[PDB]
Design an enzyme around this catalytic site. Sequence first.
Site, PDB file in Angstrom:
ATOM      1  N   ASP A  69       0.859  -1.210   0.000  1.00  0.00           N
ATOM      2  CA  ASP A  69       0.000   0.000   0.000  1.00  0.00           C
ATOM      3  C   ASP A  69       0.885   1.248   0.000  1.00  0.00           C
ATOM      4  O   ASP A  69       2.031   1.201   0.440  1.00  0.00           O
ATOM      5  CB  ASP A  69      -1.001  -0.079   1.156  1.00  0.00           C
ATOM      6  CG  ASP A  69      -0.425   0.250   2.520  1.00  0.00           C
ATOM      7  OD1 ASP A  69       0.776  -0.017   2.744  1.00  0.00           O
ATOM      8  OD2 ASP A  69      -1.186   0.783   3.347  1.00  0.00           O
ATOM      9  N   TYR A  71       2.943   4.904   0.407  1.00  0.00           N
ATOM     10  CA  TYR A  71       3.654   5.620   1.497  1.00  0.00           C
ATOM     11  C   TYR A  71       2.614   6.334   2.353  1.00  0.00           C
ATOM     12  O   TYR A  71       1.795   7.078   1.824  1.00  0.00           O
ATOM     13  CB  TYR A  71       4.679   6.631   0.967  1.00  0.00           C
ATOM     14  CG  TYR A  71       5.933   6.027   0.374  1.00  0.00           C
ATOM     15  CD1 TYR A  71       6.719   5.134   1.094  1.00  0.00           C
ATOM     16  CD2 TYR A  71       6.325   6.346  -0.910  1.00  0.00           C
ATOM     17  CE1 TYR A  71       7.851   4.567   0.542  1.00  0.00           C
ATOM     18  CE2 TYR A  71       7.453   5.795  -1.474  1.00  0.00           C
ATOM     19  CZ  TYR A  71       8.224   4.907  -0.750  1.00  0.00           C
ATOM     20  OH  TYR A  71       9.341   4.376  -1.333  1.00  0.00           O
ATOM     21  N   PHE A  82       6.479   2.643  -4.481  1.00  0.00           N
ATOM     22  CA  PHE A  82       7.854   2.863  -3.954  1.00  0.00           C
ATOM     23  C   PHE A  82       8.461   4.163  -4.501  1.00  0.00           C
ATOM     24  O   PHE A  82       9.392   4.707  -3.869  1.00  0.00           O
ATOM     25  CB  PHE A  82       8.721   1.638  -4.227  1.00  0.00           C
ATOM     26  CG  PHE A  82       8.282   0.434  -3.442  1.00  0.00           C
ATOM     27  CD1 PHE A  82       8.411   0.423  -2.060  1.00  0.00           C
ATOM     28  CD2 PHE A  82       7.707  -0.656  -4.066  1.00  0.00           C
ATOM     29  CE1 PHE A  82       7.988  -0.660  -1.316  1.00  0.00           C
ATOM     30  CE2 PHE A  82       7.284  -1.744  -3.316  1.00  0.00           C
ATOM     31  CZ  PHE A  82       7.416  -1.738  -1.944  1.00  0.00           C
ATOM     32  N   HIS A 192       9.262  -7.994   2.355  1.00  0.00           N
ATOM     33  CA  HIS A 192       9.054  -6.568   2.006  1.00  0.00           C
ATOM     34  C   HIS A 192      10.321  -5.803   2.351  1.00  0.00           C
ATOM     35  O   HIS A 192      10.946  -6.072   3.371  1.00  0.00           O
ATOM     36  CB  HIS A 192       7.833  -6.017   2.757  1.00  0.00           C
ATOM     37  CG  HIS A 192       7.387  -4.664   2.321  1.00  0.00           C
ATOM     38  ND1 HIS A 192       7.968  -3.497   2.798  1.00  0.00           N
ATOM     39  CD2 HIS A 192       6.398  -4.280   1.480  1.00  0.00           C
ATOM     40  CE1 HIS A 192       7.362  -2.458   2.265  1.00  0.00           C
ATOM     41  NE2 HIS A 192       6.406  -2.915   1.447  1.00  0.00           N
TER      42      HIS A 192
HETATM   43  O1  5CU Z   1       4.532  -1.783  -0.276  1.00  0.00           O
HETATM   44  C1  5CU Z   1       4.957  -0.710   0.201  1.00  0.00           C
HETATM   45  O2  5CU Z   1       5.357  -0.545   1.377  1.00  0.00           O
HETATM   46  C2  5CU Z   1       4.861   0.518  -0.639  1.00  0.00           C
HETATM   47  C3  5CU Z   1       4.292   0.500  -1.858  1.00  0.00           C
HETATM   48  N1  5CU Z   1       4.164   1.618  -2.600  1.00  0.00           N
HETATM   49  C4  5CU Z   1       4.560   2.856  -2.162  1.00  0.00           C
HETATM   50  O3  5CU Z   1       4.410   3.892  -2.816  1.00  0.00           O
HETATM   51  N2  5CU Z   1       5.134   2.841  -0.923  1.00  0.00           N
HETATM   52  C5  5CU Z   1       5.311   1.739  -0.108  1.00  0.00           C
HETATM   53  O4  5CU Z   1       5.830   1.885   0.994  1.00  0.00           O
END
Ligand code: 5CU
Length: 228
Positions: A69, A71, A82, A192
């Site tokens: 999900d 940030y 990410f 993760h």
């Molecule tokens: O899976 C995740 O933690 C993330 C997935 N996508 C994002 O933009 N930020 C994250 O931290």
Amino acid sequence: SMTARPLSELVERGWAAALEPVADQVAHMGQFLRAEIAAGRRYLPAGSNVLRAFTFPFDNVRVLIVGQDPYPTPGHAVGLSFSVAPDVRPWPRSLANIFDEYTADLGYPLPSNGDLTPWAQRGVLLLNRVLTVRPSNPASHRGKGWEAVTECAIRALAARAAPLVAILWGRDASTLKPMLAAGNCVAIESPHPSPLSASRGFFGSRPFSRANELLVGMGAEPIDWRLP
Ligand SMILES: O=C(O)c1c[nH]c(=O)[nH]c1=O
């Protein structure tokens, strides 16, 4: 926008067709968010960025990177998993660790910034299992209807007469493994990159080189992972 306009407008022509089976469920997610603002809770990212992963062409996707999900920090989530805007520092600890593994795997030096726009422009689909988060509450929009969408998206990819490699980071991402039961669609499963779970086998997972090893094996072109 989201509840208001149809997919044919919100995403790239290839994605709009693939995601037709969840057109309503996307409409519904539009409603859920309007209710979140009405109730006085916010969400991330901005309405226009929620579906951004699907503004890059569906037919072009060679590799899938799937986080949990977005940030939770305001000014971070851009709607590509990410990624952060080019002018953002410090990098979220999650990205910093993706970059340590990136230098370790591929030899390349630290990226200049956290914009992963280039991976997207090169056939890497930068997806979360869940496309929104309430600010400062990781996992707050889990089971709010996003899962059916990211599952539909993955099914539509695996259906393609195209090579596919899937990098799945964390347990929420791994729940998409079954829909990748397809034998023209291999999966890399590591913990993760978040500090809470990185030491548990994210570090040294070598996902980038391994993705490229697998693509070459399917007679597809490697991803140019190299970041400015
Ligand atoms: O899976 C995740 O933690 C993330 C997935 N996508 C994002 O933009 N930020 C994250 O931290």
